Design a binder for this molecule. Structure first.
Ligand SMILES: CC(=O)SCCNC(=O)CCNC(=O)[C@H](O)C(C)(C)COP(=O)(O)OP(=O)(O)OC[C@H]1O[C@@H](n2cnc3c(N)ncnc32)[C@H](O)[C@@H]1OP(=O)(O)O
Ligand SMILES: CC(=O)SCCNC(=O)CCNC(=O)[C@H](O)C(C)(C)COP(=O)(O)OP(=O)(O)OC[C@H]1O[C@@H](n2cnc3c(N)ncnc32)[C@H](O)[C@@H]1OP(=O)(O)O
Ligand SMILES: NC(=O)c1ccc[n+]([C@@H]2O[C@H](COP(=O)([O-])OP(=O)(O)OC[C@H]3O[C@@H](n4cnc5c(N)ncnc54)[C@H](OP(=O)(O)O)[C@@H]3O)[C@@H](O)[C@H]2O)c1
Ligand SMILES: NC(=O)c1ccc[n+]([C@@H]2O[C@H](COP(=O)([O-])OP(=O)(O)OC[C@H]3O[C@@H](n4cnc5c(N)ncnc54)[C@H](OP(=O)(O)O)[C@@H]3O)[C@@H](O)[C@H]2O)c1
Ligand SMILES: [Mg+2]
Ligand SMILES: [Mg+2]
Lengths: 758, 758, 51
């Protein structure tokens, strides 16, 4: 716990406190715009809203924000710690809101511990938000707040902690009945636990068609029957059962077709599973520890379908399936609330998507797709790119038929086109790489073993279990620096040290290097010096001999001093005559790759075509459809310099060698990234949307552009420089490489080594 | 009004509604970070705040936001129109907050029309904000709200609409007494008007040292004396005077040393000024129309000092002097409120800055500096870059001595260094250009007169009075397109049309062109064709003949087809042998210029040195200190390609020819923009901070980098491409030029033509 | 070691040698060590090149 505690504490404490910030979306540097954006001109918009209140959407940005409001009464599993102490959780919830759907979130921690004032303040804050996600609140005051607001608010009010997880649970049950081959009106549902995210689920399931008399509710006290306490509170009498001696979970665990558990860990015992019914449908939503372990249920009864809230098992009940996309559906039409119709229109799109998987470009073999509608796959993945095109139009149509939509949409196809254009610019492709690497770690040698960044990265890799590292350097220096940095990695146990000043394999290593380079200017004495003073050579020989599977080098020195060694020892991949390096950037238009940043100073047309094909294949392996643009200062033949002609010839060669690849050129960068400019210049261009692969005419342009964009349009680091064309898994980094970049590159190298490391 | 109404309505209605947006400041695309940013890891930060509540500043971003809260009871001069209808004004106020100081603003329009619930909701919203700027609220409920909050809030509460303008008024009076040579305890102050931004000013002036019995208050009723109404409300009895027959403004206008007017236009008459005292000190803060016209006061009495709230006169009382910087001072220390000490510590820094002007790099002769402490200059300019270094440390020191500061600062010099680093990246240099151009418009010919963008720009230029335009094209097409676009410009009155198909000056024009180009491959017949089919040639001959002062061309066609004409007709400036083009970008590090984007395909070392010197001089004329970086894929001699050696030679030449210029190289782009990387590589580099001029080795790198940065790191448009080295004021644009870019370039050309157009 | 590699870096900082590269050179390149020794006056001459 201490290591994880320190990692989380330092996750955002040192560089900048917090996890979100407020940023403007429009520019302001001039005069005569203040005369219009302020008092002299701002009077005209105001008088329009006064005459037409409905015109507040054209001249303002009112309806796009959501409030995440808490009081800190039940902070995760920590309980009542206060509203202020719960700010990090609310901030992280807003982060998840923004990262998965693109929802602006204001996180508020009201200090009120009384309900009445809670509704007072939330109703006062009405004009600020288009929807209020109540979070970290006890019961049953939340229901009262939501009902009073919805009957007093002309704007959407949606407690997500109830209704969103209700939707996710309901969709996992409607599709589960298909697999178990049972009817909704004949199944028996048993629930052990009452709380905030249980009553909404029960209401949704009852409105789905399930009989109320077939539902049994419980808590820590036992079966919630009639005649248990003199003062038995509400939200428990509408679902209570008559007293027939039933008092515990096991009394109703027999014959239960569905078991929706949302309270308490370690509740279901092996005997209860043994005495359960056939084809169990267990929904153990408990996050810190589920009600029943999915490995434990599938052992005693292999016919059980388990839909947990954890990230370690499939069919994950994560609210990131609910609060991003359900709120996005509610907002995009401008509702007045999510009634049962919208709650069902959203629950049916999720279920339809879960049983209509059709591949459509995935991360090659990187990871584990296994997308087949069955027991192990009942709901869409937490960050499915398609869950904005299926939910938002569905909710908009439901609102149009329900009378709560204020501004109807006429042409839906344009709407889906706009939403898919929006979702094309988000792709978290490093998670499957990390998962695949964790599935089977490989041996990776790091020649710069004395570097502080490399030691930090080695600690992280050992903690995550991504690879088995081998460090080259002086043992005394490495141990002293590990102690100075306060790391927990130990030589020999966590990682292996190769002493470059002394090793029993010195003779074999330098003899092999001499045999490689004897007719390339290297004498035996020079080989002996190289196997002592050049760790890259040691690592390359190690890889070639099969004592390691991959190598990450280049954090010290110049790129070509490592690349020359790599090329000499490994050589090119079969059928390849050139190599290139690709760097990745996250721009507003999406993930963007820049090709040949480090290898070739001035490639010719054939080299450019080979680089383009390799880059397209590599990007395809990430799960991204390649869209290539050949860049030049000439815009579609406007210049006749030899560089532009070379780009045109490379385009012809690429078209000859790969007719299925999306590519155009030669063109300017803005035309490559902005579709409107390109459509103005070349209406019938084969390149659609924004290009994600930019191939440059020469080294200097590529490197200068990449450096300026990296320091200017900085939105995180994924991979780079990615080396292509070499016959072994190896990448050369740069001295400015960060710890996260090193870890990512090691994971990518492990994944490459797993599949025939050639 | 209709034209301004349409301009303001379309200012932000068509492209995107609204004027602000919410943007994150940290990246999120990976896994294993959700395990730390959320539930599994987010528990560790929460338990730390529970044990230590003061630790909420290290693990959260709590204290940086301000609420701008209104109820729409007095919207500017429109009165009571509602809270929702006042959203554009609040949004614009937040825009001004962010643009001048960098303050995050949440704009709220509460529908409550009752005070008690207003304090209820604002006190409920305490944990969201570090300060509440009450706006658009009547009196005296605001005082009650502020007092109750400050006595119930442990966080800063600062009604800016009272106290900030009180500070600005007080600073304009303390410095005014120096000019008028009078004592604060012996002056007579007369006020005609009671309102929100008058009682705070009176309180501040009384605490400054002025006697209460020397202050006279008035309203529409008249003198606020005792015994006027049976129920005379508060905030008027603490300053009322005894009844001696004084009932109107003129009864107390005699002998008044200071006249602070903040209510009503057209209040002071000529006779009142005639019967006033010597050295009048008039503060007419009325925004829509001042109490007395500054031109009217200075005529009857030339000894009067007037400090108005308008932008048409000096000594402007604009809250952009108050709410950005005073709130910044309050926030940067983490106060508990702005008491009199902070209110005075901020008012003394403003006064000290107003009478301690020392130039320190201004916009050359572009505009009107005239910074001399006198009657016409009593307060710092509304967007003075230095008003964050003088106010924030002053307020922090005042808080440290007052016991309201929670986290004291030890080393102040580091603090001022950080603040000046922050303020170095903001410079609104186009406003002085626009002002200087408006002072003396010039004749500017636009060869592409039939373009829709050019017609829109011509309409804007005529409206702003920046230049006298001359359009070249077919009159029928121009009139038909003007009618189709619905513009109000009329040929012959607003602008002059030159018909390229018929003009009585055809023979002289083509004869002059032939005389220029007879030994450069142009026959007489070719000259006759050129003076019909090439509008750029017509415009260039017009400029050379003195029938126009400048030309803006290039919105259609290729850059070099216009540049060749310009070079042939005009030639180089005396003492210059090469030309270059500079493009401007607004990056996170500040205004950034990229040199030689369009002229020279591959300049040599001497050409690069000349380009660098011209770019440095041009940037200096904008009011920006030039800091040049020579860019290459080689980092301080790491490569030996001819391009890197050329950059090194150019560096040596530049150092020889300009020893006073800040410059270094050759280096990578990231080292040029990020000081930490450069300090790591070259500790003793002469380049300090972030470079704002990037000189590129060849055309392709410059253009590709500029295009990618413009479409990716887009933060508005200022100028570009700026042509340097030509012997006449002319600029060649590109086909992708926007209307705003054309207007800006025309203004720059006018300013260049005003000063010896060579 | 520190004085030697610092002097070498001061000589070669604008010739493609970083501080880390200078530190590596003052360990793996005896010719550089001898040349710095001679330039510092701790030796009068150097004979190198047998390898
Ligand atoms: C994975 C890697 O390889 S990382 C790189 C590791 N780097 C190193 O190990 C470098 C350190 N080692 C070295 O530099 C060399 O092994 C040396 C110079 C010390 C010795 O190698 P060489 O002198 O060229 O020859 P050789 O391989 O025969 O070894 C000589 C050794 O045998 C000993 N020896 C002496 N006479 C004899 C003999 N007749 N027969 C065998 N050994 C003998 C020597 O004393 C010497 O001992 P030592 O090296 O343990 O001190
Ligand atoms: C600012 C600018 O200049 S924008 C560019 C404007 N462009 C133009 O004006 C192009 C339109 N004009 C033209 O192309 C030419 O003036 C032309 C071709 C029409 C005529 O010019 P030319 O034939 O070369 O010769 P010249 O200058 O002597 O003019 C001939 C005219 O004189 C007339 N003329 C005939 N005999 C004689 C004579 N003995 N003496 C004088 N004029 C005569 C012709 O009928 C003709 O009349 P018109 O041009 O009004 O119809
Ligand atoms: N979608 C999700 O991921 C999700 C959503 C909600 C909850 N959860 C998880 O579910 C658990 C409880 O959440 P909650 O909203 O129900 O909070 P809660 O109501 O505060 O706590 C669970 C409640 O269930 C009862 N309970 C406790 N232990 C029990 C046990 N062993 N057997 C039966 N009943 C027991 C108690 O009710 P009484 O005190 O009234 O007897 C207790 O108050 C937590 O682990 C939480 O993380 C997950
Ligand atoms: N810093 C600034 O730029 C700034 C700040 C504040 C105000 N102003 C300007 O000052 C004016 C008034 O603002 P305010 O806050 O005072 O609003 P206000 O109180 O709502 O309106 C002005 C008040 O002054 C009185 N008044 C009106 N006309 C008058 C006249 N001709 N002579 C004397 N008194 C008159 C009336 O008070 P009774 O109805 O009680 O008699 C009236 O209610 C507006 O033009 C406003 O824009 C500028
Ligand atoms: Mg929660
Ligand atoms: Mg105001």
């Amino acid at each position: 716990d201490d290591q994880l505690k320190q990692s989380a504490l330092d996750f955002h404490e040192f560089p900048v406190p917090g996890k979100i910030q407020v940023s403007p979306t429009k520019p302001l540097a001039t005069q005569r715009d203040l005369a219009l954006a302020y008092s002299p001109g701002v009077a005209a918009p105001c008088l329009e809203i006064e005459k037409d209140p409905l015109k507040a959407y054209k001249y303002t940005a009112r309806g796009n924000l959501v409030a995440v409001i808490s009081n800190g009464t039940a902070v995760l599993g920590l309980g009542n710690i206060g509203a202020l102490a719960g700010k990090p959780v609310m901030e992280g919830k807003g982060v998840l809101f923004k990262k998965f759907a693109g929802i602006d979130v204001f996180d508020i921690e009201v200090d009120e511990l009384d309900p009445d004032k809670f509704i007072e303040v939330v109703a006062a804050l009405e004009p600020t938000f288009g929807g209020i996600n109540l979070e970290d609140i006890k019961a049953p005051e939340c229901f009262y707040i939501e009902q009073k607001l919805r009957e007093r608010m002309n704007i959407p009010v949606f407690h997500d902690d109830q209704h969103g997880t209700a939707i996710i649970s309901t969709a996992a049950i409607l599709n589960g009945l298909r697999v178990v081959e049972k009817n909704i009106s004949d199944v028996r549902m048993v629930v052990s636990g009452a709380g905030a995210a249980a009553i909404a689920c029960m209401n949704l399931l009852v409105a789905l068609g399930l009989q109320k008399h077939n539902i049994v509710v419980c808590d820590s006290k036992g079966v919630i029957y009639q005649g248990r306490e003199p003062n038995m509170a509400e939200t428990k009498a509408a679902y209570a059962v008559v007293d027939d001696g039933k008092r515990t979970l096991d009394d109703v665990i027999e014959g239960a077709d569905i078991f929706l558990g949302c309270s308490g860990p370690k509740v279901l015992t092996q005997e209860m599973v043994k005495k359960m019914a056939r084809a169990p449908m267990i929904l153990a939503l408990a996050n810190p520890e589920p009600e029943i372990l999915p490995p434990l249920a599938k052992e005693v009864r292999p016919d059980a379908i388990i839909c947990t809230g954890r990230s370690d098992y499939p069919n994950q009940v994560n609210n990131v399936l609910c609060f991003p996309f359900i709120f996005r559906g509610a907002l995009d039409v401008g509702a007045t609330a999510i009634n049962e119709e919208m709650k069902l229109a959203a629950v049916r799109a999720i279920a339809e998507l879960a049983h209509a998987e059709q591949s459509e470009v995935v991360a090659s073999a990187y990871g584990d797709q296994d997308l087949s509608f069955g027991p192990e796959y009942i709901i869409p993945k937490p960050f499915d790119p398609r869950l904005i095109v299926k939910i938002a139009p569905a909710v908009a149509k439901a609102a149009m038929e329900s009378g709560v939509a204020t501004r109807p949409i006429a042409d839906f196809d344009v709407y889906i086109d706009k939403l898919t254009e929006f979702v094309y610019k988000t792709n978290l492709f490093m998670k499957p790489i990390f998962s695949q690497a964790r599935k089977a770690p490989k041996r990776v040698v790091l020649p710069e073993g004395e570097e502080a960044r490399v030691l930090h990265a080695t600690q992280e890799l050992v903690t995550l279990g991504l690879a088995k590292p081998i460090l080259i350097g002086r043992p005394n220096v490495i141990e002293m620096r590990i102690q100075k940095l306060g790391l927990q990695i130990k030589a020999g146990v966590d990682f292996e040290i190769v002493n470059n000043e002394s090793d029993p394999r010195f003779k074999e290593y330098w003899t092999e290097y001499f045999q490689i380079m004897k007719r390339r200017g290297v004498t035996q004495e020079q080989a002996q010096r190289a196997l002592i003073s050049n760790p890259t050579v040691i690592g390359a020989i190690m890889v070639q001999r099969g004592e390691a599977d991959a190598m990450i080098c280049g954090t010290v020195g110049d790129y070509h001093e490592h690349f020359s060694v790599v090329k000499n020892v490994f050589g090119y991949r079969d059928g390849v005559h050139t190599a290139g390096a690709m760097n990745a950037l996250l721009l507003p238009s999406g993930n963007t790759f820049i090709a040949d940043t480090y290898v070739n100073d001035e490639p010719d047309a054939e080299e450019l075509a080979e680089i383009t094909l390799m880059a397209a294949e590599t990007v395809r392996r990430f799960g991204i459809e390649p869209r290539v643009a050949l860049l030049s200062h000439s815009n579609f033949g406007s210049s006749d310099c030899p560089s532009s002609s070379k780009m045109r010839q490379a385009l012809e060669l690429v078209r000859e060698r790969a007719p299925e690849l999306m590519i155009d050129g030669e063109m300017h960068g803005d035309a490559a990234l902005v579709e409107a400019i390109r459509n103005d210049r070349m209406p019938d261009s084969s390149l659609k949307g924004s290009a994600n692969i930019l191939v440059m005419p020469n080294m200097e342009a590529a490197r200068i552009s990449y450096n300026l964009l990296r320091v200017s349009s900085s939105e995180g680091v994924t991979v780079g420089p990615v080396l292509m064309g070499v016959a072994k898994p190896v990448h050369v980094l740069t001295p400015i490489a960060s710890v996260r970049r090193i870890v990512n590159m090691v994971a990518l190298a492990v994944v490459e080594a797993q599949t025939q490391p050639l």
